[PDB]
Design a protein around this ligand. Structure first.
Ligand SMILES: *[C@@H]1O[C@H](CO)[C@@H](O)[C@H](O)[C@H]1NC(C)=O
Ligand SMILES: *[C@@H]1O[C@H](CO)[C@@H](O)[C@H](O)[C@H]1NC(C)=O
Ligand SMILES: *[C@@H]1O[C@H](CO)[C@@H](O)[C@H](O)[C@H]1NC(C)=O
Ligand SMILES: *[C@@H]1O[C@H](CO)[C@@H](O)[C@H](O)[C@H]1NC(C)=O
Ligand SMILES: *[C@@H]1O[C@H](CO)[C@@H](O)[C@H](O)[C@H]1NC(C)=O
Ligand SMILES: *[C@@H]1O[C@H](CO)[C@@H](O)[C@H](O)[C@H]1NC(C)=O
Ligand SMILES: *[C@@H]1O[C@H](CO)[C@@H](O)[C@H](O)[C@H]1NC(C)=O
Ligand SMILES: *[C@@H]1O[C@H](CO)[C@@H](O)[C@H](O)[C@H]1NC(C)=O
Ligand SMILES: *[C@@H]1O[C@H](CO)[C@@H](O)[C@H](O)[C@H]1NC(C)=O
Lengths: 163, 314, 314, 163, 314, 163
């Protein structure tokens, strides 16, 4: 979400996808692998955080008949301290988890971009805004091979080289 | 062929380490706020004490007659409950309450105390049953006919079980010194309670108290835990509320204080005065004094956890 | 065209998860160590007790005459303060102290106790005012002319307000049994204090104590909180320091113990014995017993947070 | 701060900058965007950490008249436990925040390098030490267009291609 | 030329923030579970109390005769230890125990109490030495020949040191009122103990207790800390176990309760009832009540920290 | 550990290494710099975590003579709360440290790959699976210069350009 200016509101099929523009027509699709990886890591994070303890805490005060004022002030003091500790831990926990989540999704997008650049070796160029200036006429079946990770880099090499 | 990511029109703002208000695609809540205004007790043996006080179940006022040998996994205290019929007060109240909350119920046992030369059926108007009665588990020890010398007696009870016993006696403080002499006789009285871990220490204190339940006298209840094969002893010479039966703990339970209804349709392990907290979230913002297996209480009202990528609209 | 980053000659070493001593460009401190050796009370109603003890404000020794109905948001205790003029001691000292620290001041109210056949102006040399006086809020109850029978009296006071009242009475333990008979008369004395939440339990104990303030006798002060519309009662027959006025809490306040001066030029919400901690940092290393709205105390003297890039000099 | 051997002590205008060397002369400048992003993230981190609670804790001990020894030992025990908790939380907090800060600045530098490589597509080379072996004579106005992100990659293409 | 990383056949599964069970190359343990079933006291002055109770070292029963002036850096309590020879009980037991555990030993000092007209060598069968003895640090105060009036005496002791003193006296509660009159005489007895921080409050309570050690009587031990240059005083008229010597704290020490042997071959700063926790790991799962310089107790049995790269086998 | 399909079980000399295949024969070696950096960061992490406090906690309960039930329940309540706090802190600590460790090793591998691509500028190609399609015959001494970071990119330029 850096050099890509903005997201695609029309991409309702997945988190990441391909939007091509060739001589045949327009088309958008979703990359199942990267999206499933991201939602698997975030899902596992949720399953790691949606935890309630099995430790039982008994009633130490008394709402109907107040305990002695000294031990009551000690109990209130300790409970307030623990409350501060868990408030801090919850705040820092949520903040850190959100940071690692956003940076994780950015890392997945950048890795998808890197592997798509790995498929097209010298048969296409990079524009700088997340697109691949493809140097030869790539049919819809050719771009379908790019999405399926089956693009032969050598069978279209010289045609895309002299341009 | 271009690459990109998805986005939405209206995202959800979350907080991170670097910025506060980063709009992402999806986010879930981690702090619980929804409360069920009932006591979810599905699948739990529950005893609603109601008008009966928790300590009364050991002494047995009328309102506790149906709680003398209760058994439960969850104990609920009500604010309209009372531990006493005759105006009195327990020593170490909250200690005995905390002991009884996790007891799993109580099992009474006849201690086997016989008396000679002393009448043993002392009653009062505030302990109403068929007429004037007293605590179902206690014996108000008085004198034979009326003003007379109280024979300095001593009675012992050996804990013949494998679990500690709950021994509760009483010290009567009458409305005046002349009433103490009327019930027990003149002279300095004393009540000695002995064992291996106990060493006390009792003598009455007559005087005028404020009329509670229409009575000016008071009764001070005391208790101890008698270890197995250990014997408790009482050397008294007047003003004694003797124990009829001793209590034995059944097992384990949970004690809560609430003012909402009982509901056996929902299940929950986190209770507070306002109801039950049924949630999988790790944090809650309902009640800091919630008991049981609860989410850890935090001061924040909401803490949105990002479950999706950052939302960058066009 | 080359790319690079900035650097400095002398960086600041910080600690990370992987290494300890990584030199970066800029770094700020997170653990506070600077302390203001004053009590910053700018904009707060402050009462410096000085030579007056916090509990004395309820009983009223001479040094507390100007603190009988104080009102403050911040209460400061001094080590030279004393709760008593006549050598005595409070029962549940720290409980009543903690109650008075967050009371926002006290409001006295005449309890309305009248006596018949008993002289009520008992004084001592240690409670000096114009001559020999006593506690301004108490009445040393004695006998008529000298050795005589103390009429067993009972006096009640109903809390006619909406907030709980502070009831403080006293039990006098004279320097000898013969002095107890000289002040109240022969025979066993007793003091009964009753309400709905109270049930006690008083009888003197004459004897020789070490001369404190030039006196061998002692006075044991006791207190209770009388709920609204509830009545307190006293059935006594000698050796009684009766309460003249009851106390009512004004609101909320902060109680601190310090030995530094008061300063209304600075403002702070974190106090300790050595002064005020005015800081925005989340942690401090001054005093672990600091009270108020303080940074959380840590053992580390310093924890440098990196505010810049890693410094890689040439 | 990896393949770049060291920082520039003379760069007092910003955190990141350009140091060029062409046929006209020498020159250094600062990139306002990346620096402002880094100091905005670190500044927001500070504003998130420079927090003092609004929870008030009352006096539970007594320095002038020591409380009972048992409850005093319980109070000292609890206070020492809480002190250990906050010492650990402060240590780990500062360590993690410093780590994420350093890696954040490194990420900003690497992103600036990546986008500068995105501007110059085949009109320049990479040396490996954070410089761009530019294949054509780039005037000071041309490098000024590189810093302003206005370099036309095609109007200097063939001239920088045959070299 | 290709690039790659190393791998192993069988890796170690660890837990991360995103997934649970990620197999990596190498991993170390952070939660300690190995326990040494001994008390590692290498280089520490250690006193194994054994059959002697910690409090007995102040009063001196026979089993504590060799612990009257002990000195140690580590104090070990045993479950077979006893504080008393004559059946008795301390008031504020755990407070005095916690005081003595970190005292570094005790130093006795003759208080200098002389008596006139009262015999002072009271013994019992349960305190066996050469014959019938008593507490080595106490004096059972009785009457001259037999039934007689106990002269109401008062004795004072000024703390002539720079550290607070430990004052321990006793209140005897005989097996009956007639035995109390046999040992001290008829009439109401009283024991007054006074200082600057103390104000109490003692009178016996005769009665029949359960035969412990073959005895029906009890002895209630009490204590206070006498500040430097401050004087303690006792005004008593019978039933008094007077202190012969006072105690002074030596310095600092550690007090533990264990049932395992002492071992001077190993060294450790973390102790529990089952032995010593010698570990560098930050966490442990042996005992939550471990004392000393311990790893912080956690509920998890194991927490594997990844020390290597993720293992991706072929 | 992304586009590299799997690790090398035969690489027992280090964490990262080179596996070449030229006209002379086969060969594997280890890169001391990246491995030593990774094990230095992880080693420092361990040394930062293998810490036991110097704070001494005294005995507050009594195993032989149980304290009063009320103060005992308060002590058990506080100790259980602190136990929950340290269990949470230990869990989250180990999880975060493992995450940063794995991502750290991945970052070191990717940085090694990036610098090896920095040595070979246009004299070799990238296949996409972590190998370098070298465009000229690189002798074992030439690959030894690649591992030693002494490969002259210009003395083999035109030979590897026209292929
Ligand atoms: C502790 O806080 C509660 C409010 O949650 C309050 O009702 C109670 O009075 C406090 N305890 C004391 C001793 O004041
Ligand atoms: C968004 O998060 C909520 C949280 O419970 C979840 O129920 C929902 O399925 C999520 N939706 C998407 C599209 O991820
Ligand atoms: C209790 O006493 C009985 C008979 O005196 C004996 O058989 C039993 O073993 C004793 N149990 C214990 C635990 O002491
Ligand atoms: C360095 O950090 C301190 C911390 O307060 C700040 O005052 C100062 O302005 C900072 N300087 C720079 C150049 O960032
Ligand atoms: C207190 O008593 C008065 C008169 O007896 C009555 O009017 C008032 O409602 C009572 N208030 C409460 C709170 O009981
Ligand atoms: C608690 O620690 C303080 C020092 O901060 C000390 O003065 C006090 O005596 C300790 N409490 C007890 C009961 O020893
Ligand atoms: C693996 O970790 C353990 C943990 O103590 C260490 O002893 C061992 O040397 C490590 N081995 C390798 C190959 O890193
Ligand atoms: C204690 O008293 C002695 C003599 O009365 C005196 O010399 C000494 O200074 C006093 N010390 C303290 C600390 O009061
Ligand atoms: C506290 O827990 C221990 C077990 O670790 C138990 O033996 C003890 O009885 C508990 N305390 C109370 C007051 O029940």
């Amino acid at each position: 979400a850096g050099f890509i200016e903005n997201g695609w509101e029309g991409l309702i099929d997945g988190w990441y996808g391909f939007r091509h523009q060739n001589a045949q027509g327009e088309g958008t699709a979703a990359d199942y692998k990267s999206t499933q990886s991201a939602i698997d890591q975030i899902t596992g994070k949720l399953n790691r955080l949606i935890e309630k303890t099995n430790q039982q805490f008994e009633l130490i005060d008394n709402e109907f008949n107040e305990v002695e004022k000294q031990i009551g002030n000690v109990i209130n003091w300790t409970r307030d301290s623990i409350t501060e500790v868990w408030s801090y831990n919850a705040e820092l926990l949520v903040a850190m988890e959100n940071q690692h989540t956003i940076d994780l999704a950015d890392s997945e997008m950048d890795k998808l971009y890197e592997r798509v650049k790995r498929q097209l070796r010298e048969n296409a160029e990079e524009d700088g805004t997340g697109c691949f200036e493809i140097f030869h006429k790539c049919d819809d079946d050719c771009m379908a091979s790019i999405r399926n990770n089956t693009y032969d880099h050598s069978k279209y090499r010289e045609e895309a080289m002299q341009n | 062929i271009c690459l990109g990511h998805h986005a939405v029109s209206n995202g959800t703002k979350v907080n991170t380490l670097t910025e506060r208000g980063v709009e992402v695609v999806n986010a879930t809540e981690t702090v619980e706020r929804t409360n069920i205004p009932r006591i979810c007790s599905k699948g739990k043996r529950t005893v609603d004490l109601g008008q009966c006080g928790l300590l009364g179940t050991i002494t047995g006022p009328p309102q506790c007659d149906q709680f003398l040998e209760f058994s439960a996994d969850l104990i609920i205290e009500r604010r309209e409950g009372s531990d006493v019929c005759y105006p009195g007060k327990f020593v170490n109240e909250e200690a005995l309450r905390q002991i009884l909350r996790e007891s799993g119920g109580i099992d009474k046992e006849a201690m086997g105390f016989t008396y000679s030369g002393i009448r043993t059926n002392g009653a009062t108007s505030s302990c109403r049953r068929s007429g004037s009665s007293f605590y179902a588990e206690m014996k108000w020890l008085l004198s034979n006919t009326d003003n007379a010398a109280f024979p300095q007696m001593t009675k012992s009870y050996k804990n013949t079980r494998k679990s500690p016993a709950l021994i509760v006696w009483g010290i009567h403080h009458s409305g005046s010194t002349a009433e103490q002499t009327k019930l027990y006789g003149s002279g300095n009285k004393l009540v000695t309670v002995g064992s291996s871990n106990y060493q006390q220490s009792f003598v009455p204190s007559p005087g005028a108290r404020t009329q509670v339940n229409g009575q000016s006298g008071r009764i001070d209840f005391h208790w101890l835990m008698l270890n197995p094969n250990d014997t408790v002893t009482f050397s008294f010479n007047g003003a004694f509320i003797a124990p009829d039966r001793a209590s034995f703990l059944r097992g384990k339970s949970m004690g809560i204080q609430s003012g909402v209804q009982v509901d056996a349709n929902c299940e929950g392990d986190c209770y507070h005065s306002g109801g039950t907290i049924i949630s999988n979230l790790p944090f809650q913002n309902i009640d800091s004094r919630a008991v049981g297996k609860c989410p850890r209480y935090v001061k924040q009202r909401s803490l949105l956890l990002a479950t999706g990528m950052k939302n960058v609209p066009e």
